[PDB]
Design a protein around this ligand. Structure first.
Ligand SMILES: CCCCC/C=C\C\C=C/C=C/C=C/C[C@@H](O)CCCC(=O)O
Ligand SMILES: [Cl-]
Length: 298
């Protein structure tokens, strides 16, 4: 869960928008409002479910407890003291703490939170990487250590572990062709990628629904995928930091390898622009069937 860096928030915001924007006439108007932290129209199921989505993904609404949880606010402020004034952060947390228990449906959650949203908008916006001026400064500070806006997540990880100008860079020739290397560096790199596309959670758990989501987006059935993942899970290593590499290796070597490569390739494309599908859903077309930094691969 929390605290969340700017990329983690951008992932949450864009996924929740992608999953909840209407199709059709209201899509761009809605997007225009939500992008500016205007949770309107309030009577629209799309807006209500978008709001609940963000609240659930951040942990501000806990659908198991059917309660709001101000803890993430305190965790967020602890991580980013520059993004809040203590008294205003406390006021916001207190507003959340004092919300009643609330049923786990979009309308109820949205209705309950909306008064807090409006009364604490700038506090919440600033704290949760919604302020373009503040976030720009953070991205600049973090530089190569975080995935930047409009940057392929795969490129981010490659640049960290196989940096240009190093003797390791050449290994991308094989890595990009789904060669599964065995060394500690590759296991770490693969952890970077698998966590970056959310196939593996922050606490090293397989997220089967995320993998399935990417198969559906390339028109592939998910039953055989689930069966393969079930088999892979039965052979999970005890060491949590090898779990990303385990599942990557297992998938690449499995009876769904070609569908997996297709899904993973398209995910890399979409990872380049988190808002990929926001202005309108894009239809997938399989790219037609090597160089690294313009240099030809052996
Ligand atoms: C976690 C507090 C919010 C819960 C209330 C529900 C939804 C938030 C409302 C709108 C979210 C809009 C997200 C817009 C993204 C935008 O602010 C990111 C800009 C920062 C950047 O460009 O780097
Ligand atoms: Cl982006």
């Amino acid at each position: 869960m929390g605290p969340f860096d700017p990329e983690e928030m951008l992932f949450i915001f864009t996924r929740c928008m992608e999953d909840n924007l209407e199709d059709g006439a209201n899509r761009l108007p809605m997007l225009a409002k939500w992008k500016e932290w205007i949770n309107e129209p309030v009577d629209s199921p799309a807006t209500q479910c978008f709001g609940k989505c963000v609240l659930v993904r951040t942990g501000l609404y806990d659908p198991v407890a059917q309660k709001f949880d101000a803890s993430v606010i305190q965790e967020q402020f602890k991580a980013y003291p520059s993004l809040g004034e203590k008294s205003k952060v406390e006021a916001y947390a207190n507003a959340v703490k004092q919300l009643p228990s609330t049923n786990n449906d979009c309308a109820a959650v949205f209705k309950a939170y909306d008064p807090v949203h409006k009364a604490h908008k700038d506090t919440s916006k600033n704290l949760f990487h919604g302020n373009k001026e503040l976030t720009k400064g953070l991205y600049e500070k973090l530089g190569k250590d975080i995935r930047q806006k409009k940057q392929s997540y795969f490129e981010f990880c490659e640049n960290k572990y196989y940096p240009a100008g190093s003797d390791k860079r050449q290994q991308l020739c094989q890595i990009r062709q789904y060669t599964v290397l065995d060394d500690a560096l590759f296991k770490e790199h693969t952890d970077c990628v698998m966590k970056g596309i959310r196939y593996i959670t922050k606490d090293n758990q397989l997220d089967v629904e995320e993998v399935k989501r990417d198969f559906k987006l390339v028109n592939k059935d998910t039953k055989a995928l689930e069966e393969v993942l079930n088999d892979c899970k039965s052979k999970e290593p005890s060491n949590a930091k090898e779990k990303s590499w385990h599942y990557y290796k297992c998938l690449v070597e499995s009876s769904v390898k070609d569908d997996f490569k297709e899904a993973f390739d398209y995910r890399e494309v979409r990872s380049q622009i988190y808002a990929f599908n926001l202005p309108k859903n894009q239809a997938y077309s399989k790219p037609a069937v090597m160089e690294i930094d313009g240099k030809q691969c052996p």
